[PDB]
Design a protein around this ligand. Structure first.
Ligand SMILES: Cc1cc2nc3c(=O)[nH]c(=O)nc-3n(C[C@H](O)[C@H](O)[C@H](O)COP(=O)(O)OP(=O)(O)OC[C@H]3O[C@@H](n4cnc5c(N)ncnc54)[C@H](O)[C@@H]3O)c2cc1C
Ligand SMILES: Cc1cc2nc3c(=O)[nH]c(=O)nc-3n(C[C@H](O)[C@H](O)[C@H](O)COP(=O)(O)OP(=O)(O)OC[C@H]3O[C@@H](n4cnc5c(N)ncnc54)[C@H](O)[C@@H]3O)c2cc1C
Ligand SMILES: [Cl-]
Lengths: 138, 135
């Protein structure tokens, strides 16, 4: 496999094109990584969560990493790693349009992880992309 | 609204055996770093090979890691496992040769797909958890 690093613009294309990543957070040196659906816009990754461990850990330590990848041709692939900052988006009017937009894109996907009983109680947030790197195998 | 439940530890081992790709997260000074990784699960441990580089350097400094694995279910369903783990680097010694040889026999073709020394290592599973979602 030719493996090479991706340009900044190639990294953006991978993030833009995909909807699922793995999000890692940490507490006291211990990482924690889970899958997450996101929507890319404006050098942020937007997402919804129910309350829980990852939200608690990111509230206390907003340093995160996100990994996103896709297939190419044959055994080919492209992968991006984002080093980021968690920013919670409280349910206030200044974030309502962001919330409405994100929810409309993620609403369907949210039906694929959100536990049923037996975007109101949801935590809406974004990951600000501070550093980004990419790799491709041909 | 998915039907979601927690898996037993036994159910988690079955997911780990049935899959060969995970995401490995390590950390340095509070900053996580997550990359894809091919692994072979065996007894208390995930085994993998790597070239020298950032993840290996970070794990040498801080052995605390997390590994996430998932697979599809019926329809929109899925199962996911998260391992809270401790990195242990494995020199090429007789006591680890069977572990290495077995791991390579499971992963040798896959290694072609990402590409002098290999570093051979394992992650000791300290906690494991899982989730299953059904439509
Ligand atoms: C493809 C896909 C997309 C998803 N998208 C989202 C999303 O956008 N937003 C969202 O909030 N969740 C999403 N999930 C579910 C997410 O991965 C978590 O399972 C869920 O959010 C609960 O995480 P938590 O930290 O709140 O766990 P808590 O409810 O606080 O539970 C903590 C315990 O559960 C375990 N645990 C939690 N999740 C998993 C898991 N995935 N696998 C194994 N163990 C787990 C932890 O290790 C720990 O033991 C998605 C899942 C899949 C497979
Ligand atoms: C399905 C699949 C299976 C893989 N299996 C293995 C395996 O078993 N063993 C193994 O060593 N590697 C595997 N890889 C490659 C792995 O994900 C890393 O890209 C590679 O090991 C280099 O990691 P490093 O920490 O040594 O980075 P270094 O060579 O030390 O480089 C660090 C820099 O490159 C960036 N970087 C590293 N990896 C990636 C990536 N995946 N995507 C975007 N940026 C990246 C970092 O963010 C940082 O900027 C696999 C990849 C895929 C897609
Ligand atoms: Cl699968």
């Amino acid at each position: 496999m030719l493996v090479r690093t991706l340009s900044a613009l190639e990294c953006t294309k991978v993030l833009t094109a995909n909807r699922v990543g793995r999000l890692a957070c940490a507490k006291d040196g211990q990482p924690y990584v889970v899958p997450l659906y996101y929507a890319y816009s404006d050098a942020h990754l937007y997402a919804f969560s129910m309350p829980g461990k990852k939200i608690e850990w990111m509230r206390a330590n907003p340093r995160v990493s996100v990994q996103v990848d896709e297939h190419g041709q044959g055994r080919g692939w492209k992968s991006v790693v984002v080093d980021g900052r968690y920013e919670e988006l409280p349910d206030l009017i200044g974030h309502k349009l962001q919330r409405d937009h994100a929810w409309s894109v993620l609403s369907k996907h949210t039906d694929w992880w959100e536990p049923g009983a037996l975007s109101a109680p949801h935590v809406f947030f974004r990951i600000l992309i501070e550093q980004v790197s990419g790799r491709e195998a041909s």
